[PDB]
Amino acid sequence: LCTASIPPQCY
Numbered sequence: 001l002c003t004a005s006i007p008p009q010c011y
Contacts, residue, residue, distance in 0.1 A: 002010040 002008045
């Protein structure tokens with residue numbers, strides 16, 4: 001899943 005970041009990233 002991706003985090004609510006800008007830009008969004010996935011772990």
